[PDB]
A and B are shown apart, each in its own frame.
Chain A
Amino acid sequence: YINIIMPSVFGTICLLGIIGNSTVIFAVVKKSKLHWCNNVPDIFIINLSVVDLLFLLGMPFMIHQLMGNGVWHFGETMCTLITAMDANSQFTSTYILTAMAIDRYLATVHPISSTKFRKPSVATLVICLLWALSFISITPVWLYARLIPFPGGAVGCGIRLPNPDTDLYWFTLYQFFLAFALPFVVITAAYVRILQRMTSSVAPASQRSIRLRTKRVTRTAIAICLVFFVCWAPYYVLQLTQLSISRPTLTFVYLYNAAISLGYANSCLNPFVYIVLCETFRKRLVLSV
């Protein structure tokens, strides 16, 4: 059962997230009037789906060394490339999700003063700048992604740090800060500020429309922050735990592989959060069908 449950979990996550991400990409393209014309929200939502699609397309190239026999079959050249490609999609998707929340913060708390620089041309430049920063943030990943000789005739793709006794700390800590901690602080801070400043003093808060407006946004800000936290906290909690752990046990191995799946599930749940919590997007998708 163990050899069958784990492959099914990863495969289900990969397929379900590909369907959702391909839907967001197609819908944004088909709703366009002029490319790069008053579609700043649409530029961010289609780049997040491309990176999430990349994070799932490269998933089977990363999990085949976890299920069958734990052996890399693609050689040392692909091991560096696939590990760097997979790690880039994790960092890039988290950065686009962070920037898609700063964009929503600016569109709400500063609706007049942000019209000067919330241009589709500026949005594309920001996203292209995120990819450049993502490549810099994955530089240690591909500099040390080499083959590892395991006991027996089997080898596996992995990370060979020059000083694993001492260099193990900065590799785990810097990924926790840049890819989990800092983005989650900004994403949480942005969405709570939206809920506190989403309506005006003159707005009739006693009216049903204003209360109904805050209720839907509140459950969308909570869902976005919570889904991001739940899908990446266990991965970086076990990541920090291995520093103290010297000889892992079977239960820890099962928990570690479960946490890896949750990280891939983040790219599966991002498209559906936009599909479900946007009534406007949900209605237009049905019209096309």
Chain B
Amino acid sequence: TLSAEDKAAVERSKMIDRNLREDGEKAAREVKLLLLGAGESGKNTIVKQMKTGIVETHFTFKDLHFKMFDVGAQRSERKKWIHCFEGVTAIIFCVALSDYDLVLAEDEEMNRMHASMKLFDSICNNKWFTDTSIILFLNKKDLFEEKIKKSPLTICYPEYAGSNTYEEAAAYIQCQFEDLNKRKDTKEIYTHFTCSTDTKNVQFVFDAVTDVIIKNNLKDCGLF
């Protein structure tokens, strides 16, 4: 019992769904990454290798479109807008290895590494990232090796009782961050060692996101 013009309006609405479906499917096959990490943590160096308030960066790697979002300019409370990223494929977290004997510029008494560990568990254990895999970057790996010889790791970690070498001290720090995972069942942490001249930084994110995609497919297909 629709008039000739009411029926034409209905046909217009179904043409909009023809375009919402086209755009919604295009957004569903793309990868959304949340780029987190602190001041002088190497966050901007990673962007320099993958070329307002929020800085969105797009790039293509092996027939896969990534949307990496940098929210370093958002000085507001993180807990308020962090839920807007519920549903990203993975989180890229940048940690500076060399910032273990250093202290924060403002606090002048809190260690930089402890700040990241507090930042990591605030993100890893966040309720919106319950099943969101985290890509943990341990940047400045080469500079950390030089600084271990001069400054022992016991300054940052009193409980450490180990060799004064990179191959053992770095692994202790790496497992300390992965130890902060309060739920080792619903999520995984992917850890990679980058540098200022590396070429495998984008490959690790591509591999880690691929494993997240497989995990999401299993849940949708009902295998999980």
* Chain A contacts to B: CB under 8 angstroms: 34, 36-38, 41, 45, 103-104, 107-108, 111-113, 115, 119, 194, 198-204, 207-210, 212-213, 216-217, 220-221, 274, 277-281
Given the complex of chains A and B, what is the CA–CA distance between A210 and B215 in angstroms? Answer: 10
Chain B, range 17-49, C-beta contacts under 8 Å to A: 17, 20-21, 24-25, 28-29
- B224 touching A209, Cβ below 8 Å: no
Q: A23–B110 Cα gap in the complex (Å)?
A: 56
- For A198, what are the chain B residues with a Cβ–Cβ distance below 8 Å? 214, 218
Q: How many residues of B contact A (CB 8 A)?
A: 34
Q: Which residues does chain B contribute within 8 Å of A217, judged by CB atoms? A: 218, 223-224
Cα distance A152–B17 in the bound complex, in angstroms: 64
Q: Can you list 18 A-B contacts (CB < 8 A)?
A: A34-B17, A37-B24, A38-B24, A38-B25, A107-B221, A112-B64, A115-B29, A194-B223, A200-B207, A200-B214, A201-B207, A207-B184, A209-B186, A216-B224, A277-B223, A278-B222, A280-B220, A281-B222
Partner of A208 from B185, B208, B224 at Cβ < 8 Å:
B185
A194 to B223, CA, bound (A): 10
For residue A199, give the distance in angstroms from its CB to the closest CB of chain B: 6
Contact code string B35-76 (vs A, CB < 8 Å = 1, else 0) = 000000000000000000000000000111000000000000
A204 to B24, CA, bound (A): 32
A200 interface neighbour in B191, B211, B219, Cβ under 8 Å: B211
Residues from chain A with a CB closer than 8 A to the CB of B218 are 104, 107-108, 198, 213, 217
Q: Are A37 and B63 in contact (CB under 8 A)?
A: no
Q: Which of these, B188, B204, B213, contacts A112 with CB under 8 Å?
A: B213
Interface string of B140-158 (1 = CB under 8 A from A): 0000000000000000000
Partner of A36, one of B21, B28, B185, B186: B21
Contact B211 A107 (CB under 8 A): no
Additional pairs, 9, CB under 8 Å, beyond known A203-B190, A220-B223:
A111-B210, A112-B63, A194-B223, A198-B218, A202-B190, A208-B184, A209-B188, A217-B223, A278-B219
Could you tell me if B211 and A203 are in contact, using CB atoms closer than 8 angstroms?
yes
> Which of A38, A199, A202, A281 contacts B28, CB < 8 Å?
A38
| Across-interface contacts of A281 in B (CB, < 8 A) | 222
Contact across chains for B217 and A108 when beta carbons are under 8 A apart: yes
With beta carbons under 8 angstroms apart, the residue of A36, A38, A221 that contacts B223 is A221
**Chain B residues with CB under 8 A of A203:** 188, 190, 211
- The residue that A34 contacts in the complex, of B24, B62, B220, B222, with Cβ under 8 A, is B24
| B187 close to chain A: CB less than 8 A | yes
Binding site for A on B (CB under 8 A): 17, 20-21, 24-25, 28-29, 62-64, 184-191, 204, 207-208, 210-211, 213-215, 217-224
DSSP class of A's interface residues: helix, strand, loop or mixed? helix
Output the residue of B28, B188, B189, B191 with the most chain A CB within 10 A: B188
A34 to B64, CA, bound (A): 24
Rounded to whole angstroms, the CA-CA distance of A277 and B222 in the bound complex is 7
Give the distance to chain A from B73, nearest Cβ to Cβ, in Å: 31
CB neighbours (8 Å) of A204 from chain B are: 188-191
Complex contact A37–B190 (CB within 8 A)? no
Identity of the chain A residue whose Cβ is nearest the Cβ of B24 in the assembled complex: A37
Chain A residues contacting B208 (CB-CB under 8 Å) are 202
Query: Once bound together, how far apart are the Cα atoms of A210 and B220, in whole Å?
Result: 18
CB-CB under 8 A from A274, the residues of chain B are 222
CA distance A199 to B224 in the complex (A): 13
Inside 8 A of A119's CB, which chain B residues have their CB? 25
Contacts of B215 in A (CB 8 A): 213
CA distance A112 to B217 in the complex (A): 11
CA distance A108 to B87 in the complex (A): 20
Asked if residues A41 and B63 are in contact (CB atoms below 8 Å), the reply is no
From B219, which residue of chain A is reached at the shortest CB distance? A280
Q: Is the CB of B214 within 8 A of A199?
A: yes
Which chain A residues border B63 with CB–CB below 8 Å? 112-113
Contacts of B191 in A (CB 8 A): 204
The reply to whether A111 and B217 contact each other, CB–CB distance below 8 Å, is yes
A41 touches B220 (CB 8 A): yes
Contact partner of B21 (CB less than 8 A), chosen from A34, A111, A201, is A34
A106 to chain B, nearest CB (A): 9
Knowing A108-B217, A198-B214, A200-B211 are in contact, say whether A210-B188 is a contact too (CB < 8 A): yes
CB distance from B88 to the nearest CB of A (A): 17
